[PDB]
Amino acid sequence: EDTPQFKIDIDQEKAQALGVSINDINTTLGAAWGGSYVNDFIDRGRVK
Amino acid sequence: STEEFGKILLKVNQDGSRVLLRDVAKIELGGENYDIIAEFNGQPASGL
Amino acid sequence: SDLGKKLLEAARAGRDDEVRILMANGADVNAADVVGWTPLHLAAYWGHLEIVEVLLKNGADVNAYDTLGSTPLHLAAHFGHLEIVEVLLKNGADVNAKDDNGITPLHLAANRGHLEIVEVLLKYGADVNAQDKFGKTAFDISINNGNEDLAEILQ
Numbered sequence: 001e002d003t004p005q006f007k008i009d010i011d012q013e014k015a016q017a018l019g020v021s022i023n024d025i026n027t028t029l030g031a032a033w034g035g036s037y038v039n040d041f042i043d044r045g046r047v048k
Numbered sequence: 049s050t051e052e053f054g055k056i057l058l059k060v061n062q063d064g065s066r067v068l069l070r071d072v073a074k075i076e077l078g079g080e081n082y083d084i085i086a087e088f089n090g091q092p093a094s095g096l
Numbered sequence: 097s098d099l100g101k102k103l104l105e106a107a108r109a110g111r112d113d114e115v116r117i118l119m120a121n122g123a124d125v126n127a128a129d130v131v132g133w134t135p136l137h138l139a140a141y142w143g144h145l146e147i148v149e150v151l152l153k154n155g156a157d158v159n160a161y162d163t164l165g166s167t168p169l170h171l172a173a174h175f176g177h178l179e180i181v182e183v184l185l186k187n188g189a190d191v192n193a194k195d196d197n198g199i200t201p202l203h204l205a206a207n208r209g210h211l212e213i214v215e216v217l218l219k220y221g222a223d224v225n226a227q228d229k230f231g232k233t234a235f236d237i238s239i240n241n242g243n244e245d246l247a248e249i250l251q
Contacts, residue, residue, distance in 0.1 A: 004131040011230055012057040013066065054242060070242070 100127030107135035140168035165195035173201035206234035
């Protein structure tokens, strides 16, 4: 069934006014709260 | 909607007047391309 | 409570007969889920006019606010429930109610372009010059949305 979800509206005018890009806003939000798969590293001869 | 696309804020001037996408473009629903046009006994038609 | 959770489900689903039976058994009308939404919040959201009236008859808080400050009138106005907006306002709904963002029922109504509801809110004394956290009025929303009909109403 449908559940309560936290809707967040980014003001485009306020962002452009303070000189903050939408990419940096949507990256900071998405990375912090959601998580972000950056790249791979090798742990004991195993790419992870 | 075409309305939502119209509201897209391209930039804000020094005085603080907003420049929306509808100020520099006409916004409508129209075919991916306009090359193919079909008729059925002189009547407007599409098909497969 | 037990019946409180059943009323929340009943009010949302819109089962008028179940709500009736719950009001008789004494289901908590001030019951609230994790986000702070009462049966009235839900009834107003999902557009269940009959249950809004039944809940208000049974001492439901008309100016109840969620964990972000939004009231049933905010929801009724935003989702275009003209009948429910009138009922809420008749029963003493705060017409100039501000959420945590400083948004009002008028702002939300103007945003989705519900012309009837906007005129109902203004009739019951909606502050037309009310500014949200960005300093935007219902008029500033109307000209940005490109709603010429709504623009005329707010003058």
